[PDB]
A paper describes a structure:
Cytoplasmic dynein is a microtubule motor vital for cellular organization and division. It functions as a ~4 MDa complex containing its cofactor dynactin and a cargo-specific coiled-coil adaptor. The formation of dynein-dynactin-adaptor (DDA) complexes is a key regulatory step in dynein activation. Here, we determine the cryo-electron microscopy structure of dynein-dynactin on microtubules with LIS1 and the lysosomal adaptor JIP3.
In our structure, JIP3 residues 24-185, containing the RH1 domain and ~18 nm long LZI coiled coil, bind along the cleft between the dynein tails and dynactin. Distance constraints make it likely that one DLIChelix comes from dynein-A and the other from dynein-B. The LZI coiled coil is sandwiched between the dynein-A2 and B1 tails. Within the LZI, residues Gln89 and Gln93 interact with dynein-A2 via residue Tyr827. Additionally, a downstream patch of acidic residues in LZI interacts with both dynein-A2 (residues 759-830) and dynein-B1 (residues 420-460). These JIP3-dynein interactions are analogous to the HBS1 motif (QxxY/H followed by a patch of glutamates) found in BICDR1 and HOOK adaptor families. However, the Gln93 of JIP3 sits on the opposite side of dynein Tyr827 compared to the equivalent Gln150 in BICDR1. Furthermore, the downstream acidic patch is spaced differently with respect to the glutamine residue in these two adaptors. These differences in HBS1-dynein interactions are due to the different rotational orientation of the JIP3 coiled coil compared to BICDR1 and illustrate the variability in how adaptors can recognize the DHCs. LZI spans the minimum distance required to interact with the tails of two dyneins providing an explanation for its length.
Residue numbers in the entry:
A (entry chain m): 177 to 211, 241 to 485, 513 to 707, 745 to 766
B (entry chain f): 246 to 488, 512 to 923, 985 to 1040
C (entry chain B), D (entry chain C): 65 to 170
E (entry chain j): 349 to 373
F (entry chain h): 238 to 608
The structure:
Amino acid sequence: KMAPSVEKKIAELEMGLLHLQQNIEIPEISLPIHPFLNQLQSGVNRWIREIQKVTKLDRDPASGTALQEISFWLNLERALYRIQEKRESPEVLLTLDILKHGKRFHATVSFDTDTGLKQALETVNDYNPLMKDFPLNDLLSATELDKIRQALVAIFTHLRKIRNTKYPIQRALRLVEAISRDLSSQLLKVLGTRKLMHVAYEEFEKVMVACFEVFQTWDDEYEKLQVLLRDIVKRKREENLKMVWRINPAHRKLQARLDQMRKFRRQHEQLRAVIVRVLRDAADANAIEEVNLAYENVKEVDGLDVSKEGTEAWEAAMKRYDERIDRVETRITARLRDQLGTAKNANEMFRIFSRFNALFVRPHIRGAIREYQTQLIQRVKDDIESLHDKFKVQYPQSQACKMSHVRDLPPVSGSIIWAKQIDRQLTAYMKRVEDVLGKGWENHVEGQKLKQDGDSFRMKLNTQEIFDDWARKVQTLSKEVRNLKWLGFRVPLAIVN
Amino acid sequence: QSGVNRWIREIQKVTKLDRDPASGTALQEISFWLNLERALYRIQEKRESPEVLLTLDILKHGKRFHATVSFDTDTGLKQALETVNDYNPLMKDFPLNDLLSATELDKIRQALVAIFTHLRKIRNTKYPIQRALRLVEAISRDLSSQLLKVLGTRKLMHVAYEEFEKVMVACFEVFQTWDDEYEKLQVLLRDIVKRKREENLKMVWRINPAHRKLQARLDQMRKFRRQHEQLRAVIVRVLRPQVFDAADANAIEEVNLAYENVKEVDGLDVSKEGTEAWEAAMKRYDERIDRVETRITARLRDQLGTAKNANEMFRIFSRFNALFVRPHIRGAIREYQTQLIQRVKDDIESLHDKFKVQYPQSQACKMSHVRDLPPVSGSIIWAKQIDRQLTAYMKRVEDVLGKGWENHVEGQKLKQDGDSFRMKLNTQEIFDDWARKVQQRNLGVSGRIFTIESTRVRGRTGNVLKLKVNFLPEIITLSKEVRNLKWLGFRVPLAIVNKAHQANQLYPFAISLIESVRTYERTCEKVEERNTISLLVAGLKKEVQALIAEGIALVWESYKLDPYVQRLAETVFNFQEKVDDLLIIEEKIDLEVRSLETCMYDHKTFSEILNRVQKAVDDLNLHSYSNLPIWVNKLDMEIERILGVRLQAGLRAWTEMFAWKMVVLSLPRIQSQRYQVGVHYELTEEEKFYRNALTRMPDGPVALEESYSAV
Amino acid sequence: NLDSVLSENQEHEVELELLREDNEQLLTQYEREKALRRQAEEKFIEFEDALEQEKKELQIQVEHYEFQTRQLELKAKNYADQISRLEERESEMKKEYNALHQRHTE
Amino acid sequence: NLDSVLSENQEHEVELELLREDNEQLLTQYEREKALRRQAEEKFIEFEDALEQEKKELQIQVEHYEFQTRQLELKAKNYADQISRLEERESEMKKEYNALHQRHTE
Amino acid sequence: VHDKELAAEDEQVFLMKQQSLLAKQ
Amino acid sequence: KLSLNRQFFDERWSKHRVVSCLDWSSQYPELLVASYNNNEDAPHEPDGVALVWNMKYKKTTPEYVFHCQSAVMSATFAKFHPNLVVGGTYSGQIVLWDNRSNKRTPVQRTPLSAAAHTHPVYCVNVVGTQNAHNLISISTDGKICSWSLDMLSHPQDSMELVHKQSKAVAVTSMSFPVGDVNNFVVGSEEGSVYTACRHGSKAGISEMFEGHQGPITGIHCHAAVGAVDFSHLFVTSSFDWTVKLWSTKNNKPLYSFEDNAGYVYDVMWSPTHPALFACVDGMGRLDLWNLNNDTEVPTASISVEGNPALNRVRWTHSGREIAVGDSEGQIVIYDVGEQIAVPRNDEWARFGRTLAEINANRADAEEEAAT
């Protein structure tokens, strides 16, 4: 825990020297003095001119970072206190007093009122509760996403002290927009470090859910701050004549790009897992290198750029990926359509339908193989009718009773083995139907009757009442004891002994 | 003294200098005033040289007073100095130098605004208003010369229409700029005059700008080319032969040669010879045009001879849409005006006859109800559409007959009829009548979802009590009318919109409950149609009634309403399909039972029929219908009685005994619960085969004795 | 075998009470959230209707100002024609008055 | 007393399953209502922004039209005063012309 | 042994009882 | 010329009912499915009846009879399944009748959930190819769902259609272009035609058309494909007594055919003639508009006997016999002449010149009247 923390402190020193370099600065004026009354008038007019130069400072808040705004207001506060303490020096009071003795009232009035120090000092002193101990250094010094989250919630809980000051709400909204701007910049830096295209899917999903948690935290903290801003606006109706509530934060475009990127990567991982699983000829290798070529073609495009040329490059890369994936899909549809050139009996066709089932998630592969499924469902319907006809005769009238009599099997346990074998064949047929019609076969046109018949047939295949009737009548026996404990029936304790 | 008089004459020939403001250009006046002020200042600084005052002091010492009084009073130096310094601030800078080098009409306009803003400095000067008016006239003359040069260079005559139109548009906006800037300057001189009532006694202006007549010429040119273009439009439009006369080609060549012969004549010549050339060209053009105008009017008469309906006459009157202002076709419209008014009156009476049938008595309400439109909004759309067609008819009539068709008797009674139809076609009273009805009724949904209500159904004395969902149809119609009337611009009150939104958010559960209740009622009616199978679906009816009794305690604002609705819909759908399958298979069972009497006496067909009945009962057992063995026993008694009757027929046909007896007596019985396995009980001969057919003997065993007596 | 079934009874009791009070907490959360959503829709619908009404009032004022400007401009044009006509007539009668002083002259 | 504990156990199991399903239903529906309220607030803020800019445009057109009406009516009353004075002056020196014409007539 | 049948109740008295359940609660 | 060819009217089912939709089968061009709405005089009778009539055979009975629980609002054939008749009913279910089954009851139906339709469904279609086809349906709350014809339990795709300020367009009718599966057009009862795209980055309403002053009853895209493409054109028929011709480029109506009488309830492009479309009105009059002949008067008009209100019209795929349904359930077949149906070889170029002449003259008249 030493060397990474040392590296973070080193980066904090570099970031601190970076905004010490780029700090927009106020020129520190100095009030000159005489080492006769008209010379004093010219000197105090130079005083009034430079004080009006300093005190008329204002900045458009729609440009620049938020730290520039914070540093500007803090430096204006410090400069106004320096001007106020320099104005109250004894020598300045002395030359003002001997200008008052000379009956030059214009100089005294213009240094009393026209300087504009009083209302400027009052305004910056009113703003200074918000301007102190602001935590945005933690946002620009963080590299982990939970650190960005707690920095964001610290900034949004610092923003709740609008109620003390008389800050303009529009300037507060542009400050929020600047917070969104350097939040987007820091997120772009962190995800550029993370190299998202070069990483596996699990760590990509972890950093995606962490970044969307950051976005969600921004969202609800913004709703609470907006509730407080509505409260502070409807309480101060006479102060603001006009009021608009529009804002376009700069991180929403990066959020939409991340959402589109994640929704691409989920589909590509879902296709590529199936392809690398079940497509182990030249067509298989051809399809996998075409898939890898499409992923590398998207991968070479820098998706973190949010500009117009980056957007057009991302759309071009995604269009090329979609056309390549459609070509791969048509090639694998033509490969799957070669089934009747190989499969003649329905059993090995069932087997290759089971091995190649994972392509049937896609809609084109599912819609292409349509006339095959009717024949396959008809075959399983014939087999289900055959299984019903094997249950048409009963166990005492069956040859399985004679086969159990010969091979030393008791009749009750032989009946239970017979019923469990019928249930096993029914479950195998339902597994075959689920394989043929894919996932969601229970709501199909043909699979619904199969599911209802299988459920009502399995309801009549229960073996609990036979075991209960045997246990009631018994309250060859050891044959029942050591056969029925294989079948999972909880035998009574008095019968084991 | 002699040189003093020489100086007196030398400055008296300069201090009396004056330039007539009516003659010359404005720039000549500007240069004259600047040069006069500069020369007056030059002789002023030469007058104040000390050696001149030395000569006057010498002449004063010589008692020569008369030269000093001449040099004091007869000079006129001070008055002329006050004149050239009073006119100085107006004359210091002046913007016609930018106008003289300007070549584009916006530069002309900006030089105009520069000149007229520089003219605003007269209020602090003692400039005469008449000299200012002549200065404005000189500015107008320079404007006329400059834009005449610009228009001559652009050559607006021989060139195509659209850009020629846009350069006269820019020229006319330049003229408008001159007009309103002169208006501002005129009220400025008016307010200047209002301070100097006793000084200036010349009130009226009577200014005639030089460009104005040229403006009128351009104005004439404007409408002339406009007329020609419009005429050429219809001459390429209607002149096609309706399915090639020499008249239409003669008209195309007459228009082309008339425009060429008027293109030869120059129109930019503002002089008297140019004016008479312009007038001769327009007289020649009118003489060439009036022939094809009469041809167009005659073809309008021949085209109107075959036109019958009002829409036909409106569609052919709008073919000559660009010639409504030419004063020859207006007479043709005046001759055919009465037929137009009469036939439009018939169309208005036809629309009044439509509206005479009320909305619920008409087919429009029925077809709106088919296409899912509530009746009040459908009536509003109906009345608005009749009003829109009335407005379209009035707009067409006004557009073809010109503005001012009111004064005729037919026009005023047509306007009276339209006014009566429009105040009969108001839509607001229907809207707030509906709003008053809905606000008085005070709808809204709450409480539990179901409702039992007992009604008197005809054919039954006892009051049949039914079950419905607590969701009125008026709720759904109110939601539809709110969604329709909010589109239509009509202001609906707050409670109605809130009720409609609550209804729209509670609708998908209510419609599914309504469908499930209706399906359950229809399936129970189908079960009550056939009393013989009421015990087969006792379990499904018990399950559905248990679900109804479970869900009857739910409230509308509950959280349990989302899965319960889906469960109820699934259960009722399963119950309905089970009852329909039971109906089909029981009809098959009854058909197979009734065919046993007509089946001929042999073992194989009896075994096949019994196998089909056994397969149907097996399919009953696979879906696990309730109370199956009791219904199977009730069927078994019937088929055993039928087999007893057929045994009577087979025995009396014989009147080798047991070989004939085992045909019926060895038939397998119907097994109800046969899917059960494991119970090792063996059925005996009487419950496996119909060994009790002699017990169900219809005539008794005496016929059996008749089988025994023959042996 | 009373020990095992009483153990099952004890675990059933403690889990039933724990997730029963957890259920009561989610039911309170549901009721609060439903009330919040309903009030949000009511505020939105009120804001809809009031602001659209004042929009329609602004449109009515725009159309009325347009009609007033058109009729006042028409008044100004025809009345300026009146100025020009009466100025021409008084110019003519000034000319005839100068002719009457000419009639006095000879 | 095994049967009473067995009955208690199965009753506790059926109550556990019932109000566990109630718990899952309440959680899912609470999530649904929260998402719907978020949707409603998004509709409010977008419709706010859009038609507030529309309203400001219409207000701008309104007092522009008011300025046009005021300046045209001021020009109209200046025109009113000047033609009133002009007709008064023309009438009085028309009377003077009539008196001087009768002076020349006699 | 033969088990006696189960039968759902008559609809009129069933939803009459449910009408009483609706009115009482 | 226009002449009667056949009259379909069943005594038991199609009495006191108004026809609600018509379709000809794509595979079997002699088969007409005709939807019906509820007869209020017979509450015991089924609310929604869908009959299937035959053109080749000369019997008066319907060849197939289907009925659903609720009133059927729009039933079409399945374009790639020869055995299925897909209907959309008043409650929002999408019932799927089968002909091989022994029951008139539907064999498949969609749930009435929030994930499926809830308001009446007035437009259903089957789009795609053999290997990829879907069923598109839009309710009157604007919800559009794309189902597969097998699994009618939940939609494959679903969205709500909103254009501006998330306001739900209430879709009344829907059309698709020729050979297009992505783009389509919808006509609402708010009077506004919207184009829309099914899937892509931009999914939902693309543009907006102002146009009509009443609810829009029927919108149909161009069907005949020849030398010059005309798939960007479509026609609409609405409640304001007009038929308006549009293209997807211009945001304004290219022409407004005022049927000066009664309302206008349906319009349809002919599938063979590239310049001919038919419309029905409210007093029984059926009109054919050939744009190459005349754009002001109907080319050929007919009136059914008794003059009932006419709901729906539908052309056959040969473009020779058109079918029209009225307020009494009487499906009438009208046989157009070969001089109107069969186009000449220059009809596409003639329609291109006619469209250019319409555009130029109307725009020139507008800009010369305004200025």
